[PDB]
Design a protein around this ligand. Structure first.
Ligand SMILES: COC(=O)CCN(c1ccc(S(N)(=O)=O)cc1)c1nc(C)cs1
Ligand SMILES: [Zn+2]
Length: 257
């Protein structure tokens, strides 16, 4: 009886195996844009993905992960609200059964169709597994997806999905450039939070871009053809793999703009 998104193992049950689910800095949150404070001391976000080395794409039974080479100083995030240098390790998405839901963060209660998370770890801690034990261990860049015009930079991901339909399946996935997933503007909101899946560790500086990217109906439809089950098991479509908004508690959301 493992965690998941279903009626019997979803977000409302996670606290039994992961008490920190009811903690003081859980994610995601609703971003109330009128209460977010503009902070002129915030720096532009520096996204340096020119040398990124993707390696593989994996269905982990919750989402799909695009994994990177994080053994050298390639694909880093810095500036913004961050101190020091955070290295990209992987990206993944959360999405809905319908276009009207799927994001984890919300903006004045608006749900987007999906949300991309680019996960980075603070190089001060030497690798990811040590970083997640620290309050400033990770930086997750969150980007909303809306349904409209296709995102040509996403198509390479979409097209490989049929090769990893089921949990545990992986495919070589080299030479994918995550710059093709970014909107034009890097304006953002930021706050201290957590992983949005178990183990729900309170280690993340969240950086959520204001501008969504557009993907097509057909692209998201292919995300919703994935399966949460393994091969040879009854089919459970991979949809609604998002945790809803958690209490803000003693936090402030800051705006770069
Ligand atoms: C003990 O730590 C974890 O399991 C975090 C799990 N996870 C993950 C899960 C969710 C998110 S989210 N949804 O908060 O961005 C980030 C990281 C990742 N593990 C690796 C090795 C890369 S990303
Ligand atoms: Zn995520």
């Amino acid at each position: 009886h493992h965690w998941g998104y279903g009626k019997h193992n979803g977000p409302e049950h996670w606290h039994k195996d992961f008490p920190i689910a009811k903690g003081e800095r859980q994610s995601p949150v609703d971003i109330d844009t009128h209460t977010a404070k503009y902070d002129p001391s915030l720096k532009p976000l520096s996204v340096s993905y020119d040398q990124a080395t993707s390696l593989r794409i994996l269905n982990n039974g919750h989402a799909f992960n695009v994994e990177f080479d994080d053994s050298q100083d390639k694909a880093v995030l810095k500036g913004g609200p961050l101190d020091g240098t955070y290295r990209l390790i992987q990206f993944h998405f959360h999405w809905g059964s319908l276009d009207g839901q799927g994001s984890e963060h919300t903006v004045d209660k608006k749900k987007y169709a999906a949300e991309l998370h680019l996960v980075h770890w603070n190089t001060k801690y030497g690798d990811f597994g040590k970083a997640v034990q620290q309050p400033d261990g990770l930086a997750v860049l969150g980007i909303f997806l809306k349904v409209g015009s296709a995102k040509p930079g996403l198509q390479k991901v979409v097209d490989v999905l049929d090769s990893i339909k089921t949990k545990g399946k992986s495919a070589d996935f080299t030479n994918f450039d995550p710059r093709g997933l970014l909107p034009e503007s890097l304006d953002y909101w930021t706050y201290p939070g957590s992983l949005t899946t178990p183990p729900l560790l309170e280690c993340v500086t969240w950086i959520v871009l204001k501008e969504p990217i557009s993907v097509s109906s057909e692209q998201v439809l292919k995300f919703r053809k994935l399966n949460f089950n393994g091969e040879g098991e009854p089919e459970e479509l991979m949809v609604d793999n998002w945790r809803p908004a958690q209490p803000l508690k003693n936090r402030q959301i800051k705006a770069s703009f």
